[PDB]
Amino acid sequence: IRRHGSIAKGVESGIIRSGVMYECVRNQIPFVLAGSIRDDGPLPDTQMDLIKAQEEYAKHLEGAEMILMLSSMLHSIGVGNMTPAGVKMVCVDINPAVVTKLSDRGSIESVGVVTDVGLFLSLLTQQLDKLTSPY
Amino acid sequence: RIRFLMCPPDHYDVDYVINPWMEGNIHKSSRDRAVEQWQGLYQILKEHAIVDLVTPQKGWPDLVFTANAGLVLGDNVVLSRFLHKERQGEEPYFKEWFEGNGYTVYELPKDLPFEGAGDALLDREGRWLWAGYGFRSELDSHPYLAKWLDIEVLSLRLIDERFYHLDTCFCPLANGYLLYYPGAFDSYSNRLIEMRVAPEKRIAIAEADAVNFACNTVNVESIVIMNKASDALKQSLTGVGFQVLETPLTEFLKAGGAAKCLTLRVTEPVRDEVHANVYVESRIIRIEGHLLDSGLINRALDMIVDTGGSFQVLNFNLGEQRQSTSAAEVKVSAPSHEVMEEIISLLIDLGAVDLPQDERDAKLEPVIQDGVAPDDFYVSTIYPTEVRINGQWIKVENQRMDGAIAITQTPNGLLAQCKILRDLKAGEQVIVDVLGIRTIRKTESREQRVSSERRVELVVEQVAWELRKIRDAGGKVVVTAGPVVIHTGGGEHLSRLIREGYVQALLGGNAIAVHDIEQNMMGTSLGVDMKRGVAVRGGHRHHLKVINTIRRHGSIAKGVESGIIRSGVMYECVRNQIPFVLAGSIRDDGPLPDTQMDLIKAQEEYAKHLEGAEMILMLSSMLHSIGVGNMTPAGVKMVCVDINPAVVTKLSDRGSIESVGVVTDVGLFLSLLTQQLDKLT
Amino acid sequence: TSRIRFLMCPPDHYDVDYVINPWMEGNIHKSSRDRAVEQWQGLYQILKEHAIVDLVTPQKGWPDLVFTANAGLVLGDNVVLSRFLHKERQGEEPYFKEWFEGNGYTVYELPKDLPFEGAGDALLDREGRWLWAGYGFRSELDSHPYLAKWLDIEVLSLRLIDERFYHLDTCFCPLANGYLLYYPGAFDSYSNRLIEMRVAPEKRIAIAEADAVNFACNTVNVESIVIMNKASDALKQSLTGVGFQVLETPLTEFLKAGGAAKCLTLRVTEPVRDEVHANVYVESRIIRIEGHLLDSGLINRALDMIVDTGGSFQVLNFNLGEQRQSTSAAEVKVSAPSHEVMEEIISLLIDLGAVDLPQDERDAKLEPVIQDGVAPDDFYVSTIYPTEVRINGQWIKVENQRMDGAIAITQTPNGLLAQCKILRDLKAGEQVIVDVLGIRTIRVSSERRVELVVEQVAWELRKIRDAGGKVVVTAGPVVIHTGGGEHLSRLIREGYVQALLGGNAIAVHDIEQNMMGTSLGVDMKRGVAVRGGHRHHLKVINTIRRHGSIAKGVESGIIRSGVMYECVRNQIPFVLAGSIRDDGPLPDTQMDLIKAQEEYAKHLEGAEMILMLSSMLHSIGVGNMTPAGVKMVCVDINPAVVTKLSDRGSIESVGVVTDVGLFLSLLTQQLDKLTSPY
Amino acid sequence: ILRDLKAGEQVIVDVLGIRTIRKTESREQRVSSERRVELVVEQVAWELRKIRDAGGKVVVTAGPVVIHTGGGEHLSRLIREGYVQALLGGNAIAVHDIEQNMMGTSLGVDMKRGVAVRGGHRHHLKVINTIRRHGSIAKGVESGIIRSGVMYECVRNQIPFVLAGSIRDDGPLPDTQMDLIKAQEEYAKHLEGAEMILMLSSMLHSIGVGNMTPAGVKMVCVDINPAVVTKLSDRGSIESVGVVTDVGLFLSLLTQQLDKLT
Ligand SMILES: NC(=O)c1ccc[n+]([C@@H]2O[C@H](COP(=O)([O-])OP(=O)(O)OC[C@H]3O[C@@H](n4cnc5c(N)ncnc54)[C@H](O)[C@@H]3O)[C@@H](O)[C@H]2O)c1
Ligand SMILES: NC(=O)c1ccc[n+]([C@@H]2O[C@H](COP(=O)([O-])OP(=O)(O)OC[C@H]3O[C@@H](n4cnc5c(N)ncnc54)[C@H](O)[C@@H]3O)[C@@H](O)[C@H]2O)c1
Ligand SMILES: NCCC[C@H](N)C(=O)O
């Protein structure tokens, strides 16, 4: 990816053909990769100026009606701190302590579930299918 | 010519239970060893002073505890009003004695408990009064004390029920010395103590001495009298010219009292300067909603008391139906302005409001240094907020938690916007204090809410030994640490390790530094009470205040140099010139100016200090532990402590010969570590 | 009286201007007034083909005036005018009121601040026999007796528990000929039981979530015609199968605000029968509670308890106390939808120190024990707290206090004796306290891993069944607590389980879940509760002991479904091994553990596979008895348990760390997939 | 199994003439703060001495994790010096405590290095066979083969114990009550008058004892699983205190803080 210069060029060149990042690129979903101290590389797309990363996070959080926080303590807290009340928040993690901390804006705003995030996503998509079947 | 008031144990007993020491001891009193122990005190004291006596009375066995009779200064005395009715009958007899010895007697309202010199201790040079509260004396009696004794009153809060009276854990001595037990007081009170009493005059005793009622000491000039003392106590007392005289008082420890409690000095130092000074503040707030069933009113009262204030519910208007709204007016008291601010901030969230005639404009202060808020800036929350500017309520924009509120006059009118600290610009007006702020949350929003210990001791033995060997051999040890080190009490121990040569470099993030500094500067740590071991809900003001302050001084080193940072992990790093790196993170508040937010550079800096390392100590940092791991070649001993068994396993790919791991409490680990290190000399 | 007339209101001033239900969230000003006008005209015009439609004058600033269903409730010449919970709709009331007055109705008005939102929340039985009335989100329970008296009709109360279905007419729809279109998941266990008692199974059309979120229950039924927003064709076939004609007309612009066809209409010509008169099942009891109510938050805890259990309240007075440390006193009128719910509520308030007002004190009710070790029906269940009971106008202390017993009153030389006894100690001829009168107290494996073990285990189970081999299940009560019971009973009914080994607990809770929809008082419809009473639990144990066995409970008809039911009906042998913490126990439970081990061993003979579902004590017991060569499948959320059980290696031990319920859910759905090439 | 053997049967001893016939592939294969904790210990220790001086009644329920974690010696000490008027448990705690004192092992656990071990069954069954031979634990002690540990101290100071059977029991010991109706009656009998109940990693026996125990009884629940500690605290913060740690750790602190009180 570093040789190509970006994730998008990896998609344009044909070497990335499927997956999460692929779909963000092909459907033009904006994404932000915030750097960390343990990053390998990193990818060219990754923002290693964290002042900027926070600002980009904040910009993309404007107008959000809902935030899905999938098994990511460092990033979910980062996002919580930037988010005003009134935004539905869904926190998925296997550690009960993480979910407890993130879920403290109460039932009408904080929904927490302690489960494997993969199983959760599997049930979520299969549930979304069920809502489609009366067409 | 000093006079003490005492009362003979002729009808002494434990008839009932009103403090924890009395538990079980009902009718377990030996009147004769009581009589004889009481004599020992009596006789010793007449060898140094005049002793007057109260006529003992059948049916009031606690009359022997004359320290609670009242509080005497000059010709004035404030009569004790007892909380428990088991002792209220003592009041006429104590009153009779005071009036028969010429004193002007002041009596508190019959609803303000106050329990005498036993709960309120004079500074022996007579400069101020230390009044306690928490269990027996109400906070709201303190301004009556100042008014009537014409003296400066300093409020201390009692948090441990064992030390339910101030004189059981606090004891002013001759020539400015203080015998106190810091663990009976909350963080705000300990801070008050340290700022009035210079460190060389402070005598903090251990828990062992304190449960033998060591603070419950009569001090007559250079003579101190008490029940028992460890010789570690006798050593310090003599070390500044105090002669310690012991005498058994065990039969009275069973009702809850010792030497001090059995006496009341009625000859006290009236000074020169003194005049009435009280720091206690009071405010009436109003709360409206479904108070009884939302548990709204009940959560408000909890925030008030837990933060260190008191309340009086002045009136309740009950709505006519379940869906009718109710209203409550509540008088709030705080021991200082700072604690009142803490309390009003939490209440603003719950939607408490000023009475509409006491509405006032928010207070404003200019920014003068880019990225630094003025002192005492209000800390924003996640909730929708209005502020009052020249008589008008204005909506705050870009609402976010842990920010400040900036006010501007624009071509389009008044603008109130929430800004994080580092975005503030010289010239902006910022809300300080807590007037003219309310929340506009809607109804329903407001109405709602694996490793063995013995295994562990094994590892500690192993690590400790290899850790000294490396220090003697002039080697290099690196530490990576997360905030859980602070939260669990590990801080003092890591301070100690750095101070005594075990740590050549420290690698962490923003949070560990902010939390360590918060804890040393204010005795708190956001999200955690490190004086009782469980989590707490608020704490954001203390946290942002530390961030704003270090940003003001411009670095941690200048915080230390300027003397505002006097202790703890980061302090020791600066004092012993131990290099530290703080690598930024996406979740960082502020950040501190020391924090490296360029992560390419942060990685280069981490690598630079890892060179030559012979051991790496990884203390609950997970993210920084892995980062350091990737950078570290083989041949480097790696010790990984974390409570999550998943990260400890994640960090041990170097086999049982280079990496050792344990799944416990890192504070526990660092205690054992520091103990086992002491046994090695 | 054969001409049908409806009230509606055109959308001239309609938009979503605020949020007062979950549907409006995120939809402020997202209504297309063109599609809204066109969609309302579709419904208006279809309706005029079958009925009379009158119109209210639309009004600026009151967009939800189009939902005339909430205007009020009409029966004959009387209407109860609705009072809205939210002020955003309260300005509608005068316009509705004047429409009703202009059309000659007698208008009854509830007390101010007592919410009731009309036919939207109260639905008449189509033959006019009674009125179904909802509560939980908008209407107050205490509105219901007003409806019964003023409209002169029997009123049945239903508790809504899902905020998406905040009005009865979004999830419940009485139809011609006694049929009922409804969504069970919108209701608590009591309410579902009440629905099933009044409407025969062949008359119930329970719909699926996919239909409910399209507002399929929000249906206008004229005669054999049903009009709605959208129906899946499974729902069309069910409805047309019993003779209804389904008319669809899109109403999505109105779904954005939380309403559809039925919400947009109000029938003002309703069937009035002379033999139909006022009847109330709602009960109320004034209660008194004292202490530091504001500090300890006791008042808050009790009110929350009343509302969680299905009841309501009204604080009649609150006395602060005249000095700072003095106690507070509150008198609270508590109400419940039935006598049964009032007993669960009063039991919880007793446990907390609530007492009767002096003038309301009554003696405890007593019933005799006719069979040793069996209490009479509706015996009071005791707590840990010290307890006094009123016998013959006098209060006496209860001895040997212990939770989960009965209170036996007996005569002795010198005086009356009240003692707490566990059920099995009760003796014939003893009097036992029933009802709640005259009682008071004094102060982890990855997704891919899980999916691969499920594939492997399902293929294994199908294979053993087809070959006529033997599979044994060991299970603990967590299978039921977490929600996995119906998956296990399905395994047992479809032939995958040849023997079940367990304990007293799993049988008690499975039978509790199937008789009363609760497990340890936790309603499965809601997920969890503020804990839950032991009454349901104890009634089960008592009822089975009276019958004499689980099988007799099935023969008698009181156990109709569940794990134990399937074992009995398919003759799957089971063994219930006793333990030190057993309540009761059930008669079926083996309390001689030498024998229990021998029975376990006998049933383990020939086993090719053992499913160990979340049961450490029993799974280890079973492991020790089982030779190598038996496939073993261990499911538990604690990694340590699974590690210990899985030490016969990969070819024999399969372990997965996951919730046993989810596991069973994936297992059954996997077994279905293996069936679909037939 | 041992209890099915009959006088006259021949039984294999030693290890000659035994082989396994496993097939190829079969053979070729294979939340609570520390400081919080020190708080509770301080509280429990103090209330525990107060009750002992006042001649009160303290009951202990204990599971094998007490032995495995090193807690044994400390519980021995508590019983020996008057803090425990009754002991309630199961088969396993007794077998493990006796195994450990008699052979310094404990099935499934190495209590000299703090991690689990794989074998240990011979030592375990040998203890069971031996006590069954003497016919009771008291006669094991009297005959001098049991010289130390929890069950030893119970017998030496005449502290009543109940061992309630379980479906997983090996043996069982002849002392173990396998009639659970009776076992419940026996537990209840010794819980009368109790002023405190100390619940040391027993979960199953802790709940059993809980159901039987009226209010006004102080209940201390130590377990490493945070789920059972929460399960046992329905008596509010004034009657039930709980901690989520190592029970051996707990009992060490407890015994240390008890020493500081003299
Ligand atoms: N190759 C690289 O460059 C690299 C590699 C690793 C991490 N990083 C960076 O380190 C930072 C930390 O990443 P993070 O947010 O994943 O760590 P995190 O500390 O925030 O932990 C994520 C959470 O997932 C939970 N968890 C574990 N298994 C789970 C499961 N099955 N289901 C649900 N939850 C589960 C954990 O309890 C944790 O709270 C990231 O920003 C990351 O990009 C970079
Ligand atoms: N009412 C009664 O009479 C009654 C009540 C309770 C227990 N008992 C008896 O006590 C004995 C102990 O019962 P037990 O076997 O259930 O206890 P157990 O100690 O054996 O624990 C069962 C296991 O389930 C695990 N667990 C918890 N939640 C889980 C989840 N979602 N998914 C998967 N695993 C989960 C636990 O880690 C545990 O290892 C039983 O014999 C029981 O009948 C009787
Ligand atoms: N300061 C000693 C007071 C002791 C007395 N029994 C009391 O509880 O007030």
Ligand SMILES: NCCC[C@H](N)C(=O)O
């Ligand atoms: N069933 C119609 C009610 C819909 C309306 N918007 C409300 O929230 O009341």
